[PDB]
From Swiss-Prot:
GO biological process, one term: protein secretion by the type III secretion system
Enzyme type, top EC level: translocase
Full-sequence range covered: 83 to 430 of 430
Places the protein is found: Cytoplasm
Official protein name in the record: Type 3 secretion system ATPase
Gene behind the chain: sctN
Species the sequence originates in: Shigella flexneri
Function: ATPase component of the type III secretion system (T3SS), also called injectisome, which is used to inject bacterial effector proteins into eukaryotic host cells. Acts as a molecular motor to provide the energy that is required for the export of proteins. Required for type III secretion apparatus (T3SA) formation, proper protein secretion, host cell invasion and virulence. May play a critical role in T3SS substrate recognition, disassembly of the effector/chaperone complex and unfolding of the effector in an ATP-dependent manner prior to secretion.
């Protein structure tokens, strides 16, 4: 099985057969080539070490969860936790050369929502969208993930810094299970990375949490395979914190490899402040907080608003690395 690749797909919407069915942008490049959708992962000796940050423009991620070029990062959330808006922010406020989105959704309205977003995005000329809805077979739903990854791999071989999004691994795995009935990952999940001889694919895989923010077996397996995970808390969403990232239950496993020492120090001091705030929140809920009785508790209390203001981010705003580190420094003062 082969699929179209190349710069002529920039601005295009591609179906699970690999054909263009819609456009959210038009470009002057018409390059169309063909590649197999199944390809072995790089050899260990062809991979470069993850050592350069992949900046997202999102304050909490760039400061506490810093991604690296070539990393695979999970995004874990229940329904209604802002996963799609977080992906929109990751596309809009990062600095990749090319974005490849693979939607393994179920209803055509979600695909159309992503198409309309891209139609109004500043990144439209550098995106490719691959989709499969519930109307498509399970074979077609798995193939959409493979097509998206093969397109990203072509741009990586050209030298580009590519961001790949697969939404969602949960529905990919459900379709894979259905296909297995008729008769895989991490073979899919190990295809991203930075190549010594080429560019990089930095990949974000979404995982749905069922019921509360509970990790079914698939979620545990995915978390073990990836280089980190961002957890979106329904509880933080209902309190009105957007992005609803729970940084104390999130991790980038490459963090200390991609930021410098002064950043490490600031991030550790901020995380210690967040933990102190969570303990104080419980003490408040227990009715045991009385102003003036404990000066360290009062100091923590008076940090809550500045901390919340650092974590909060309008989805239309992106922050440079220098701005983010300036702000986190002000917060821990």
């Amino acid at each position: 099985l082969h699929t179209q690749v190349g710069r002529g797909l920039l601005g295009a919407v591609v179906n699970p057969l690999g054909e263009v069915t819609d456009k959210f942008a038009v470009t002057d490049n018409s390059e169309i080539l063909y590649r197999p959708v199944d390809n072995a992962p790089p050899l260990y000796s062809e991979r470069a070490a993850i050592e350069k940050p992949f900046l997202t423009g999102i304050k909490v991620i760039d400061s506490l969860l810093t991604c690296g070029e070539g990393q695979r990062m999970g995004i874990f959330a229940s329904a209604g936790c802002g996963k799609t808006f977080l992906m929109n922010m990751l596309i809009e406020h990062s600095g990749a050369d090319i974005y490849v989105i693979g939607l393994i959704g179920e209803r055509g309205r979600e695909v159309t929502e992503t198409v309309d977003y891209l139609k109004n995005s500043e990144k439209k000329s550098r995106c490719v969208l691959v989709y499969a809805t519930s109307d498509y077979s399970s074979v077609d739903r798995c193939n959409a993930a493979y097509i998206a990854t093969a397109i990203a791999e072509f741009f990586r071989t050209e030298g580009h810094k590519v961001a790949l999004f697969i939404d969602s691994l949960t529905r990919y795995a459900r379709a894979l299970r259905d296909v297995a009935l008729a008769a895989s990952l991490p073979r899919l999940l190990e295809r991203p990375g930075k190549l010594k001889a080429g560019g990089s694919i930095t990949a974000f895989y979404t995982v749905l949490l069922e019921d509360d923010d509970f990790a079914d077996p698939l979620a545990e397996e995915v978390r073990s395979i990836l280089d980190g995970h961002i957890y979106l808390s329904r509880n933080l969403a209902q309190k009105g914190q957007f992005p609803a990232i729970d940084s104390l239950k999130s991790i980038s496993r490459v963090f200390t490899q991609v930021v410098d020492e002064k950043h490490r120090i600031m991030a550790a001091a901020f995380r210690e402040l967040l933990s102190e705030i969570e303990e104080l929140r419980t003490i408040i809920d227990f009715g045991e907080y009385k102003p003036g009785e404990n000066a360290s508790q009062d100091k923590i209390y008076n940090k809550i608003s500045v901390v919340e203001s650092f974590l909060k981010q309008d989805y239309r705003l992106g922050f440079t690395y220098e701005q983010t580190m300036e702000l986190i420094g002000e917060t821990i003062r």
